[PDB]
Amino acid sequence: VKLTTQAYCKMVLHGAKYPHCAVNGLLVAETLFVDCIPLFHGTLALAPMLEVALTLIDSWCKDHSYVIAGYYQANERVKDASPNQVAEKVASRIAEGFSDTALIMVDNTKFTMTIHVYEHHENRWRCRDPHPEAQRISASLLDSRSYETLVDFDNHLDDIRNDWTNPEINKAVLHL
Amino acid sequence: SLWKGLVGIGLFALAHAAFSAAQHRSYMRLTEKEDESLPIDIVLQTLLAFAVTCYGIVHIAGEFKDMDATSELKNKTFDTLRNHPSFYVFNHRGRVL
C-alpha cells in the first residue's frame, strides 16, 4: 500500500488543471501503485466513454504486464469527501477482477503540502489511517507552471495525436 | 493592404483626367471650334482608371462566407458548451490559492 511520487504528481496536477470541475483518474499497478492516468473531467455519470477507456487500457496494459488495481475521484466542491455511487460501482467492478483494489478520494481542503483512502475488505469501502520528497517535487513542478501540457483521455477523444501516457512528465520527474 | 493604394491611384488618375478635360473644353469654347471630339489619351486614361478601380474595390469589399451552419461547428468541444456563465460558483479548489 505505497504512494508513488509520480502518481500523486499526475493526480493533483489533473486536479489543478480543471480546478472547478469534478475529475476522476486511474492508478495502474503491475500493493504498489505505479502510474496515474487523468482520464476524465466533467459530469462523469455516463457509461460508454468510461467503458471504452477501461477496455482500451486493459488491452494496452496487458502488453506491459500491468493491471489497474486503483481508482481516484476528486469532487468539484472542496467541502465534500463522500464516495458517491459512481466510484463505488467502478471499484466494485474493478475488485471483481482483482479483489484487492483500493479507492482514493483526495480531501482537497488542504491542496498544498490530502489523501482519504478507503478499502472494501468485505466492507463498503471503509476508511483507514495515514501510511516527503514527492511533496517537494509536487510543489516545485506545480509552481513550474507545467500542467498545461498534461493530456487526459477526454482530450484524446478530440485530438487523437496526443498520448495519455504522457511520458514527458515521467522523464521530467525522473530528472529531478 | 496594397489594394487600397491601387484604388487611391485609380481615383487620382481619374481626377487628373477630369481636370485635363475641363481645360480642353475651355480651349474649345475659346477657339469657337465646337466641332471636335476629345483626344484619345484622356479616354484611355479614364477607362483604365475605372477598370483598375473596380478590380481593386471587389477585393477590398470584403469576403464571402458559407451558408452551411455546421462549417463553424467543426472546431468545437464540450468545454466551451458546458460552462454556462450565468450559473457560476466559486466554492472550489481555486480559492485555496
For cell 473596380, name the residue.
B54
Measured between CB atoms, does B95 come within 8 Å of chain A?
yes
User: Which residues of B are less than 8 Å from A16 in CB distance?
Assistant: 93
Using CA coordinates, name the residue in chain A closest to B88. A20
N- to C-terminal Cα separation, chain A: 24
Set of cell numbers at residue B84: 454556462
Please tell me if residue B33 touches chain A, with a CB cutoff of 8 Å. Answer: no
- How many Cβ atoms from other residues are within 10 Å of residue A139's Cβ? 12
Q: Which residues of A32-69 are buried (b: 16+ CB within 10 A; e: fewer)?
A: ebbbbbbbbbbebeeeeebeebbeebeeebeeeebbbb
Nearest-neighbour CA in chain B from A90: distance (Å): 24
Output Rg (C-alpha) for chain A, integer angstroms.
Answer: 15
Q: In chain B, what residues touch A108 (CB-CB under 8 Å)?
A: 93
C-alpha cell at A10: 499526475
Q: By C-alpha distance, which of B44, B17, B66, B97 is closest to A19?
A: B97
Structure resolution in Å? 3.4
**Cβ contact (<8 Å) for B94 and A158?**
no
- Per-residue burial over A110-138, b if 16 or more Cβ lie within 10 Å, else e, is ebeebebbbbbeeeebeeeeeeeeeeebb
Sign of CA dihedral A45, A25, A151, A161: negative
Q: What is each CA distance from A6 to A33, A136, A171, B65, in whole angstroms?
A: 10, 12, 10, 49
Nearest CA in chain A to B78: A42
Q: Tell me the C-alpha to C-alpha distance, in Å, between residue A53 and each of A26, A68, A76, A88.
A: 10, 12, 22, 18
Give the distance from residue B94's alpha carbon to the nearest chain A alpha carbon, in angstroms. Answer: 6
Rounded distance, CA B52 to CA B88, Å?
A: 55
Interface residues from chain A to B (CB-CB < 8 Å): 15-16, 19-20, 42, 76-79, 108, 110-112, 158
Q: Cβ separation of B91 and A20 shorter than 8 Å?
A: no
Q: Specify the amino acid at residue A7.
A: A
Length of chain A: 176
Q: Say how far apart CA B21 and CA B35 lie, in whole Å.
A: 15
Report how far Cα B45 is from the mean position of its chain's Cα atoms: 21
Does B77 reach chain A within 8 Å, measured CB to CB? yes
Q: C-alpha cell of A139? A: 510543489
Chain B residues lying within 8 Å of A19, measured CB to CB: 92-94
**Do β-strands A102-105 and A67-74 pair in parallel, antiparallel, or remain unpaired?**
parallel
Pairs of residues, one from chain A and one from chain B, whose beta carbons lie less than 8 Å apart: 26
Q: How far apart are CA A103 and CA A94, in angstroms?
A: 10
Residue type, A31: T
Cβ separation B96–A78 shorter than 8 A: yes
User: What residue in A sits closest to B82 (Cα-Cα)?
Assistant: A42
Give dist(CA A120, CA A70) in Å, integer.
Answer: 12
State the smallest CA–CA distance between residue B75 and chain A in angstroms.
9
User: Contact A78/B95, CB-based, under 8 Å?
Assistant: yes
Contact A77 B92 (CB under 8 A): yes
The dihedral region occupied by A122, where left means phi > 0, alpha psi between -120 and 50, and beta the remainder, is left
- Parallel, antiparallel, or unpaired: how do β-strands A126-127 and A35-42 relate? unpaired
Experimental method: cryo-EM
- Whether A106 and A115 have beta carbons less than 8 Å apart is answered as yes
